[PDB]
Amino acid sequence: MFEQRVNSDVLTVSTVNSQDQVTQKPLRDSVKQALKNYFAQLNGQDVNDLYELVLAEVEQPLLDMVMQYTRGNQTRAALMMGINRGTLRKKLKKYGMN
Amino acid sequence: SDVLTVSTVNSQDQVTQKPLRDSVKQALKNYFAQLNGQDVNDLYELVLAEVEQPLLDMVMQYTRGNQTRAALMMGINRGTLRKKLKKYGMN
DNA sequence: AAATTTGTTTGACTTGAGCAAATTT
DNA sequence: AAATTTGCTCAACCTCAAACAAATTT
């Protein structure tokens, strides 16, 4: 009764294909494209912080969304995210989400 | 300005850039919608695994396999990088 | 008023540096 | 042959549950 929904398909984005048809695609692929386009625009000094860059760019909207969904409740938010309420406070502090 | 962006197309077939964080927001909006008060449980590791895999995959390909360079480029310890590659079975 | 959440403090699961072996240059 | 990288140890330097009093939401 239950069709398999793979991990790549839990977080998806609307795309437009060659037959001009709207179709979901893994968020994975967005991250891939963002990086592909970042590397090409890299002519060509050293990089020292790619992880923190990507991480911030991803944590910020996760926190934003989780907080909208729990309507400010940091306890609920922390529970659903699977992290300790203290690290959630720290992260919200980091991105000025207060 | 925004260094991490993706391409989009509108109805007039113009391609334009969009910060990746907008994609992430969209995906989450969708995720929350599709489930109806079913409890969400490990959202952080979920998103993290969805972002670390294509990150590792893309810097490994860029450094042609050089873990040392990949690690320097990412700003993480080489041991950490080893751990993550083991974790998503890219080793 | 009772229950829950906040805000805060305590104290208990990434990194540089080695070094030998393998690999690339 | 030399230089660099991998693979693997070390031990020392963020996330966590817990507690609890004060604010707040129910």
Coordinates of all heavy atoms in Angstrom, one line a residue, chain B residues 5-89:
Chain B
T5 N 24.3 30.4 -5.0 CA 23.0 30.6 -5.7 C 22.7 29.5 -6.8 O 23.6 28.8 -7.2 CB 23.0 32.0 -6.5 OG1 24.0 32.0 -7.5 CG2 23.2 33.1 -5.5
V6 N 21.5 29.5 -7.2 CA 21.0 28.5 -8.2 C 20.3 29.3 -9.3 O 19.9 30.4 -9.1 CB 20.1 27.4 -7.5 CG1 20.7 26.9 -6.2 CG2 18.7 27.9 -7.3
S7 N 20.2 28.6 -10.4 CA 19.5 29.2 -11.6 C 18.1 28.9 -11.5 O 17.6 27.8 -11.1 CB 20.1 28.6 -12.8 OG 21.5 28.6 -12.7
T8 N 17.3 29.8 -12.0 CA 15.8 29.6 -12.0 C 15.4 30.2 -13.4 O 16.1 30.9 -14.0 CB 15.2 30.5 -11.0 OG1 15.4 31.9 -11.3 CG2 15.7 30.2 -9.6
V9 N 14.2 29.8 -13.8 CA 13.6 30.4 -15.0 C 12.2 30.8 -14.7 O 11.5 30.1 -14.0 CB 13.6 29.4 -16.2 CG1 14.9 29.2 -16.8 CG2 12.9 28.1 -15.9
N10 N 11.8 31.9 -15.3 CA 10.5 32.4 -15.2 C 9.7 32.2 -16.4 O 10.1 31.5 -17.3 CB 10.5 33.9 -14.8 CG 11.2 34.8 -15.8 OD1 11.2 34.6 -17.0 ND2 12.0 35.8 -15.3
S11 N 8.4 32.6 -16.4 CA 7.5 32.4 -17.6 C 8.1 33.0 -18.9 O 7.8 32.5 -20.0 CB 6.1 32.9 -17.3 OG 6.2 34.1 -16.6
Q12 N 8.8 34.1 -18.8 CA 9.3 34.8 -20.0 C 10.7 34.1 -20.4 O 11.4 34.7 -21.2 CB 9.5 36.3 -19.8 CG 8.2 37.0 -19.8 CD 8.4 38.5 -19.5 OE1 9.1 38.9 -18.6 NE2 7.8 39.4 -20.4
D13 N 10.9 32.9 -19.9 CA 12.1 32.2 -20.2 C 13.4 32.9 -19.9 O 14.5 32.7 -20.5 CB 12.2 31.7 -21.7 CG 11.1 30.7 -22.0 OD1 11.1 29.5 -21.4 OD2 10.1 31.0 -22.7
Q14 N 13.4 33.8 -18.9 CA 14.6 34.4 -18.5 C 15.2 33.6 -17.3 O 14.5 33.2 -16.4 CB 14.4 35.9 -18.1 CG 13.8 36.8 -19.2 CD 13.1 38.0 -18.6 OE1 12.4 37.9 -17.6 NE2 13.2 39.1 -19.3
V15 N 16.5 33.4 -17.4 CA 17.2 32.7 -16.3 C 17.7 33.7 -15.3 O 18.1 34.8 -15.7 CB 18.4 31.9 -16.9 CG1 19.3 31.4 -15.7 CG2 18.0 30.8 -17.8
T16 N 17.6 33.4 -14.1 CA 18.0 34.4 -13.1 C 18.6 33.7 -11.9 O 18.3 32.5 -11.7 CB 16.7 35.3 -12.7 OG1 16.8 35.7 -11.3 CG2 15.4 34.4 -12.9
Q17 N 19.3 34.3 -11.0 CA 19.9 33.6 -9.8 C 19.0 33.8 -8.6 O 18.3 34.8 -8.4 CB 21.3 34.1 -9.5 CG 22.3 33.8 -10.6 CD 22.4 32.3 -10.9 OE1 23.0 31.6 -10.0 NE2 22.0 31.9 -12.0
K18 N 19.2 32.9 -7.6 CA 18.4 32.8 -6.5 C 19.2 32.3 -5.4 O 19.9 31.3 -5.6 CB 17.2 31.9 -6.7 CG 16.2 31.7 -5.5 CD 15.1 30.8 -5.9 CE 15.4 29.4 -5.6 NZ 14.2 28.6 -5.8
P19 N 19.2 32.9 -4.2 CA 20.1 32.2 -3.1 C 19.6 30.8 -2.8 O 18.4 30.6 -2.7 CB 19.9 33.2 -1.9 CG 19.3 34.4 -2.5 CD 18.5 34.0 -3.7
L20 N 20.6 29.9 -2.6 CA 20.3 28.5 -2.2 C 19.4 28.4 -1.0 O 18.5 27.5 -0.9 CB 21.6 27.8 -2.0 CG 21.5 26.3 -1.4 CD1 21.0 25.4 -2.4 CD2 22.8 25.9 -0.9
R21 N 19.5 29.3 -0.1 CA 18.7 29.4 1.1 C 17.2 29.4 0.8 O 16.4 29.0 1.6 CB 19.2 30.4 2.1 CG 18.7 31.9 1.8 CD 19.4 32.8 2.7 NE 20.5 33.5 2.0 CZ 20.5 34.7 1.4 NH1 19.4 35.4 1.5 NH2 21.5 35.1 0.8
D22 N 16.9 30.0 -0.4 CA 15.5 30.0 -0.8 C 14.9 28.7 -1.2 O 13.8 28.3 -0.9 CB 15.3 31.0 -2.0 CG 15.5 32.4 -1.7 OD1 16.0 32.7 -0.6 OD2 15.1 33.3 -2.5
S23 N 15.8 27.9 -1.9 CA 15.5 26.5 -2.2 C 15.3 25.7 -0.9 O 14.3 25.0 -0.8 CB 16.6 25.9 -2.9 OG 16.6 26.4 -4.3
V24 N 16.2 25.9 0.1 CA 16.1 25.2 1.3 C 14.7 25.5 1.9 O 14.0 24.6 2.4 CB 17.2 25.5 2.3 CG1 17.0 24.7 3.6 CG2 18.5 25.1 1.7
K25 N 14.4 26.8 2.0 CA 13.2 27.2 2.6 C 12.0 26.6 1.9 O 11.1 26.1 2.5 CB 13.0 28.8 2.6 CG 12.1 29.3 3.7 CD 12.3 30.8 3.9 CE 11.2 31.3 5.0 NZ 11.1 32.8 5.1
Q26 N 12.0 26.6 0.5 CA 11.0 26.0 -0.2 C 10.7 24.5 0.1 O 9.6 24.1 0.3 CB 11.3 26.1 -1.7 CG 10.1 26.0 -2.6 CD 10.4 25.7 -4.0 OE1 9.8 24.8 -4.7 NE2 11.5 26.4 -4.6
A27 N 11.8 23.8 0.1 CA 11.8 22.4 0.4 C 11.2 22.1 1.8 O 10.3 21.3 1.9 CB 13.2 21.8 0.4
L28 N 11.6 22.9 2.8 CA 11.0 22.7 4.1 C 9.5 23.1 4.2 O 8.8 22.5 4.9 CB 11.8 23.6 5.1 CG 13.1 23.0 5.5 CD1 13.9 24.1 6.2 CD2 12.9 21.8 6.4
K29 N 9.1 24.2 3.4 CA 7.8 24.6 3.4 C 6.9 23.4 2.9 O 5.9 23.0 3.5 CB 7.6 25.8 2.4 CG 6.6 26.8 2.7 CD 6.7 28.1 1.9 CE 7.5 29.2 2.6 NZ 7.8 30.4 1.7
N30 N 7.5 22.8 1.9 CA 6.8 21.7 1.2 C 6.7 20.5 2.2 O 5.6 19.9 2.3 CB 7.6 21.3 -0.1 CG 6.8 20.3 -0.9 OD1 7.3 19.1 -1.0 ND2 5.7 20.7 -1.4
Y31 N 7.8 20.1 2.8 CA 7.9 19.0 3.8 C 6.8 19.2 4.9 O 6.0 18.3 5.0 CB 9.3 18.9 4.3 CG 9.6 17.8 5.3 CD1 9.2 16.5 5.1 CD2 10.1 18.1 6.6 CE1 9.4 15.5 6.1 CE2 10.4 17.1 7.5 CZ 10.0 15.8 7.3 OH 10.2 14.8 8.2
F32 N 6.9 20.4 5.5 CA 5.9 20.7 6.6 C 4.4 20.6 6.0 O 3.6 20.1 6.7 CB 6.1 22.0 7.2 CG 7.3 22.2 8.0 CD1 8.1 23.3 7.9 CD2 7.7 21.1 8.8 CE1 9.3 23.4 8.7 CE2 8.9 21.2 9.5 CZ 9.7 22.4 9.5
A33 N 4.2 21.0 4.8 CA 2.9 20.9 4.3 C 2.4 19.5 4.1 O 1.3 19.1 4.5 CB 2.8 21.7 2.9
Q34 N 3.2 18.7 3.4 CA 2.8 17.3 3.0 C 2.5 16.4 4.2 O 1.7 15.5 4.1 CB 3.9 16.6 2.2 CG 3.9 17.1 0.7 CD 5.1 16.5 -0.1 OE1 6.1 16.0 0.5 NE2 5.0 16.4 -1.4
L35 N 3.2 16.7 5.4 CA 2.8 15.9 6.6 C 1.8 16.8 7.4 O 1.9 18.0 7.4 CB 4.0 15.5 7.4 CG 5.1 16.5 7.9 CD1 4.7 17.4 9.0 CD2 6.3 15.6 8.3
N36 N 0.8 16.1 8.0 CA -0.2 16.9 8.7 C -0.2 16.6 10.1 O -1.0 15.8 10.7 CB -1.6 16.5 8.1 CG -1.8 17.3 6.7 OD1 -1.1 17.0 5.8 ND2 -2.8 18.1 6.7
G37 N 0.7 17.4 10.8 CA 0.8 17.2 12.2 C 1.4 15.8 12.6 O 1.2 15.4 13.8
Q38 N 2.0 15.1 11.7 CA 2.7 13.9 12.0 C 3.9 14.5 12.7 O 4.4 15.5 12.3 CB 3.1 13.1 10.8 CG 2.0 13.1 9.7 CD 2.2 12.0 8.7 OE1 2.8 10.9 9.0 NE2 1.8 12.2 7.5
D39 N 4.4 13.8 13.7 CA 5.6 14.4 14.4 C 6.9 14.3 13.6 O 7.2 13.2 13.0 CB 5.7 14.1 15.9 CG 5.7 12.6 16.2 OD1 4.5 12.1 16.1 OD2 6.7 12.0 16.7
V40 N 7.6 15.4 13.5 CA 8.8 15.5 12.8 C 9.8 15.3 14.0 O 9.6 15.7 15.1 CB 9.1 17.0 12.3 CG1 10.5 17.1 11.8 CG2 8.0 17.4 11.3
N41 N 10.9 14.6 13.7 CA 11.7 14.1 14.8 C 13.2 14.4 14.8 O 13.8 14.7 15.8 CB 11.5 12.7 15.0 CG 11.3 12.3 16.4 OD1 12.3 12.1 17.1 ND2 10.1 12.3 16.9
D42 N 13.8 14.4 13.6 CA 15.3 14.6 13.6 C 15.6 15.6 12.4 O 16.5 15.2 11.6 CB 16.1 13.4 13.6 CG 15.9 12.5 14.8 OD1 16.1 13.1 15.9 OD2 15.5 11.3 14.7
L43 N 15.0 16.7 12.4 CA 15.0 17.6 11.3 C 16.4 18.0 10.9 O 16.8 18.1 9.8 CB 14.1 18.7 11.5 CG 13.7 19.5 10.2 CD1 13.5 18.5 9.1 CD2 12.5 20.3 10.5
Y44 N 17.2 18.3 12.0 CA 18.5 18.8 11.8 C 19.4 17.8 11.1 O 20.1 18.2 10.1 CB 19.2 19.3 13.1 CG 20.5 20.0 12.8 CD1 20.5 21.4 12.6 CD2 21.7 19.3 12.8 CE1 21.7 22.1 12.4 CE2 22.9 20.0 12.6 CZ 22.9 21.4 12.4 OH 24.1 22.0 12.2
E45 N 19.4 16.6 11.5 CA 20.3 15.6 10.9 C 19.7 15.3 9.4 O 20.5 15.0 8.5 CB 20.4 14.3 11.7 CG 21.3 13.3 11.1 CD 22.7 14.0 10.9 OE1 23.2 14.6 11.8 OE2 23.3 13.8 9.8
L46 N 18.4 15.4 9.3 CA 17.8 15.2 8.0 C 18.4 16.2 7.0 O 19.0 15.8 6.0 CB 16.3 15.3 8.0 CG 15.6 15.2 6.7 CD1 15.9 13.8 6.0 CD2 14.1 15.3 6.8
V47 N 18.2 17.5 7.3 CA 18.7 18.5 6.4 C 20.2 18.4 6.2 O 20.7 18.5 5.1 CB 18.3 19.9 6.9 CG1 19.0 21.0 6.1 CG2 16.8 20.1 6.7
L48 N 20.9 18.2 7.3 CA 22.4 18.1 7.3 C 22.9 17.0 6.4 O 23.8 17.3 5.6 CB 22.9 17.9 8.7 CG 24.4 17.9 8.9 CD1 25.0 19.3 8.4 CD2 24.8 17.7 10.4
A49 N 22.3 15.9 6.4 CA 22.7 14.8 5.5 C 22.3 15.1 4.1 O 23.0 14.7 3.1 CB 21.9 13.5 5.9
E50 N 21.2 15.9 3.9 CA 20.9 16.3 2.5 C 21.8 17.4 2.0 O 21.8 17.7 0.8 CB 19.4 16.8 2.5 CG 18.7 16.6 1.2 CD 18.5 15.1 0.8 OE1 18.6 14.2 1.7 OE2 18.3 14.9 -0.4
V51 N 22.6 18.0 2.8 CA 23.5 19.1 2.4 C 25.0 18.7 2.4 O 25.8 19.2 1.5 CB 23.2 20.4 3.1 CG1 24.2 21.5 2.6 CG2 21.8 20.8 2.9
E52 N 25.4 17.8 3.3 CA 26.7 17.4 3.4 C 27.1 16.5 2.3 O 28.3 16.6 1.8 CB 27.0 16.7 4.8 CG 27.3 17.6 5.9 CD 27.8 16.9 7.2 OE1 27.3 15.8 7.4 OE2 28.6 17.4 7.9
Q53 N 26.3 15.5 1.9 CA 26.6 14.6 0.8 C 26.9 15.4 -0.5 O 28.0 15.1 -1.0 CB 25.5 13.6 0.6 CG 25.5 12.5 1.6 CD 24.2 11.7 1.6 OE1 24.2 10.5 1.0 NE2 23.2 12.2 2.1
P54 N 26.1 16.3 -1.0 CA 26.5 16.9 -2.2 C 27.7 17.9 -2.0 O 28.4 18.2 -2.9 CB 25.3 17.7 -2.7 CG 24.5 17.9 -1.4 CD 24.7 16.7 -0.6
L55 N 27.9 18.3 -0.8 CA 29.0 19.2 -0.5 C 30.3 18.3 -0.6 O 31.2 18.7 -1.3 CB 28.9 19.8 0.9 CG 30.2 20.7 1.3 CD1 30.5 21.7 0.2 CD2 29.9 21.3 2.6
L56 N 30.4 17.2 0.1 CA 31.5 16.3 0.0 C 31.7 15.8 -1.4 O 32.8 15.9 -1.9 CB 31.3 15.1 1.0 CG 31.2 15.4 2.5 CD1 30.7 14.2 3.2 CD2 32.5 15.9 3.0
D57 N 30.6 15.4 -2.0 CA 30.7 14.9 -3.4 C 31.3 16.0 -4.3 O 32.1 15.6 -5.2 CB 29.3 14.5 -3.9 CG 29.4 13.6 -5.1 OD1 29.8 12.5 -4.9 OD2 29.0 14.1 -6.2
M58 N 31.0 17.2 -4.1 CA 31.5 18.3 -5.1 C 32.9 18.8 -4.8 O 33.5 19.3 -5.7 CB 30.5 19.5 -5.1 CG 29.2 19.2 -5.8 SD 29.6 19.3 -7.6 CE 28.7 17.8 -8.1
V59 N 33.4 18.7 -3.5 CA 34.7 19.2 -3.3 C 35.7 18.1 -3.5 O 36.9 18.3 -3.8 CB 34.9 19.8 -1.9 CG1 33.8 20.6 -1.5 CG2 35.1 18.7 -0.9
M60 N 35.3 16.8 -3.4 CA 36.1 15.7 -3.7 C 36.4 15.6 -5.2 O 37.5 15.3 -5.6 CB 35.5 14.4 -3.2 CG 35.7 14.1 -1.7 SD 37.3 14.7 -1.1 CE 38.3 13.3 -1.3
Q61 N 35.3 16.0 -5.9 CA 35.5 15.9 -7.4 C 36.4 17.1 -7.8 O 37.1 17.0 -8.8 CB 34.1 15.9 -8.0 CG 33.9 16.6 -9.3 CD 32.5 16.6 -9.7 OE1 31.7 15.8 -9.2 NE2 32.1 17.4 -10.7
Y62 N 36.3 18.2 -7.1 CA 37.1 19.4 -7.5 C 38.5 19.3 -7.1 O 39.4 19.9 -7.8 CB 36.5 20.6 -6.7 CG 37.2 21.9 -7.0 CD1 36.9 22.7 -8.1 CD2 38.2 22.4 -6.2 CE1 37.5 23.9 -8.4 CE2 38.9 23.6 -6.4 CZ 38.5 24.3 -7.5 OH 39.1 25.5 -7.8
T63 N 38.9 18.5 -6.1 CA 40.3 18.3 -5.7 C 40.8 17.0 -6.2 O 41.8 16.5 -5.8 CB 40.4 18.4 -4.2 OG1 39.8 17.2 -3.6 CG2 39.8 19.6 -3.6
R64 N 40.0 16.4 -7.2 CA 40.3 15.1 -7.8 C 40.7 14.0 -6.9 O 41.4 13.0 -7.3 CB 41.5 15.4 -8.9 CG 41.3 14.6 -10.2 CD 41.0 15.5 -11.4 NE 42.0 16.6 -11.5 CZ 41.9 17.6 -12.4 NH1 40.9 17.6 -13.3 NH2 42.8 18.5 -12.4
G65 N 40.2 14.0 -5.7 CA 40.4 12.9 -4.7 C 41.2 13.3 -3.5 O 41.3 12.6 -2.5
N66 N 41.9 14.5 -3.6 CA 42.8 14.9 -2.6 C 42.1 15.3 -1.3 O 41.6 16.5 -1.1 CB 43.7 16.1 -3.1 CG 44.9 16.4 -2.2 OD1 44.9 16.0 -1.0 ND2 45.8 17.1 -2.8
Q67 N 42.0 14.4 -0.3 CA 41.4 14.6 0.9 C 42.0 15.8 1.7 O 41.3 16.5 2.4 CB 41.4 13.4 1.8 CG 40.5 12.3 1.3 CD 40.5 11.2 2.4 OE1 41.4 11.0 3.2 NE2 39.4 10.4 2.4
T68 N 43.3 15.9 1.6 CA 44.0 17.0 2.3 C 43.6 18.3 1.8 O 43.2 19.2 2.6 CB 45.5 16.8 2.2 OG1 45.9 15.5 2.8 CG2 46.3 18.0 2.9
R69 N 43.5 18.5 0.5 CA 43.1 19.8 -0.1 C 41.6 20.0 0.2 O 41.2 21.1 0.6 CB 43.4 19.8 -1.6 CG 44.8 20.3 -2.0 CD 44.9 21.0 -3.3 NE 44.4 20.3 -4.4 CZ 43.5 20.7 -5.3 NH1 43.1 22.0 -5.3 NH2 43.1 20.0 -6.4
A70 N 40.8 19.0 0.0 CA 39.4 19.1 0.3 C 39.2 19.6 1.7 O 38.4 20.5 1.9 CB 38.7 17.8 0.0
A71 N 39.9 19.0 2.6 CA 39.8 19.4 4.0 C 40.2 20.9 4.2 O 39.5 21.6 5.0 CB 40.6 18.5 4.9
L72 N 41.3 21.3 3.5 CA 41.7 22.7 3.7 C 40.7 23.6 3.2 O 40.4 24.7 3.8 CB 43.1 22.9 3.0 CG 44.1 22.1 3.8 CD1 45.4 22.0 3.0 CD2 44.4 22.8 5.1
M73 N 40.2 23.3 2.0 CA 39.2 24.1 1.3 C 37.9 24.2 2.1 O 37.3 25.3 2.2 CB 38.9 23.4 0.0 CG 38.5 24.3 -1.1 SD 38.3 23.4 -2.6 CE 37.4 24.6 -3.5
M74 N 37.5 23.2 2.8 CA 36.3 23.2 3.6 C 36.5 23.9 5.0 O 35.5 24.3 5.6 CB 35.7 21.8 3.8 CG 35.0 21.3 2.6 SD 34.7 19.5 2.7 CE 33.6 19.5 4.1
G75 N 37.7 23.9 5.5 CA 38.0 24.5 6.8 C 37.7 23.5 7.9 O 37.5 23.9 9.1
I76 N 37.7 22.2 7.6 CA 37.5 21.2 8.7 C 38.8 20.3 8.7 O 39.5 20.2 7.8 CB 36.3 20.3 8.4 CG1 36.5 19.5 7.2 CG2 35.1 21.2 8.2 CD1 35.3 18.5 6.9
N77 N 39.0 19.7 9.9 CA 40.0 18.7 10.1 C 40.0 17.6 9.1 O 38.9 17.2 8.7 CB 39.9 18.2 11.5 CG 41.0 17.2 11.9 OD1 40.9 16.0 11.8 ND2 42.2 17.8 12.3
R78 N 41.1 17.0 8.8 CA 41.2 15.9 7.8 C 40.5 14.7 8.4 O 39.9 13.8 7.7 CB 42.6 15.6 7.4 CG 42.7 14.7 6.2 CD 44.2 14.6 5.7 NE 44.9 13.5 6.3 CZ 45.8 13.6 7.3 NH1 46.1 14.9 7.7 NH2 46.4 12.6 7.8
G79 N 40.6 14.6 9.8 CA 40.0 13.4 10.5 C 38.5 13.5 10.4 O 37.8 12.6 10.0
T80 N 37.9 14.7 10.6 CA 36.5 15.0 10.5 C 36.1 14.6 9.1 O 35.1 13.9 8.9 CB 36.3 16.5 10.6 OG1 37.0 17.0 11.7 CG2 34.8 16.7 10.9
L81 N 36.8 15.0 8.1 CA 36.4 14.7 6.7 C 36.4 13.2 6.4 O 35.5 12.7 5.7 CB 37.4 15.4 5.7 CG 37.3 15.1 4.2 CD1 35.8 15.3 3.8 CD2 38.1 16.1 3.5
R82 N 37.4 12.5 7.0 CA 37.4 11.1 6.9 C 36.1 10.5 7.5 O 35.4 9.7 6.8 CB 38.7 10.5 7.5 CG 40.0 10.9 6.8 CD 41.2 10.1 7.2 NE 41.3 8.9 6.4 CZ 40.9 7.7 6.7 NH1 40.4 7.5 7.9 NH2 41.1 6.7 5.9
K83 N 35.8 11.0 8.7 CA 34.6 10.6 9.4 C 33.3 10.7 8.6 O 32.5 9.8 8.5 CB 34.4 11.3 10.7 CG 34.1 10.5 11.9 CD 32.6 10.7 12.4 CE 32.5 11.7 13.6 NZ 33.1 11.2 14.9
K84 N 33.2 11.9 7.9 CA 32.0 12.2 7.2 C 31.9 11.4 5.9 O 30.8 10.9 5.5 CB 31.9 13.7 6.8 CG 31.7 14.6 7.9 CD 31.5 16.0 7.4 CE 31.6 17.0 8.5 NZ 30.8 16.7 9.8
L85 N 33.0 11.1 5.2 CA 33.0 10.3 4.0 C 32.7 8.9 4.4 O 32.0 8.2 3.6 CB 34.4 10.4 3.3 CG 34.8 11.8 2.8 CD1 36.3 11.9 2.6 CD2 34.0 12.1 1.6
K86 N 33.2 8.4 5.5 CA 32.8 7.1 6.0 C 31.3 7.0 6.3 O 30.6 6.0 5.9 CB 33.6 6.8 7.3 CG 33.0 5.6 8.1 CD 33.9 4.4 8.0 CE 33.9 3.7 6.6 NZ 32.5 3.6 6.1
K87 N 30.8 8.1 6.9 CA 29.4 8.2 7.3 C 28.4 8.1 6.1 O 27.4 7.4 6.2 CB 29.1 9.5 8.0 CG 27.6 9.8 8.3 CD 27.5 11.1 8.9 CE 26.1 11.5 9.3 NZ 26.0 12.9 9.8
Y88 N 28.7 8.7 5.0 CA 27.8 8.7 3.8 C 28.4 7.7 2.8 O 28.0 7.7 1.6 CB 27.6 10.0 3.2 CG 27.1 11.1 4.2 CD1 27.9 12.2 4.5 CD2 25.9 11.0 4.8 CE1 27.5 13.2 5.4 CE2 25.4 12.0 5.7 CZ 26.2 13.0 6.0 OH 25.8 14.0 6.8
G89 N 29.3 6.8 3.3 CA 29.8 5.7 2.5 C 30.4 6.1 1.2 O 30.4 5.4 0.2

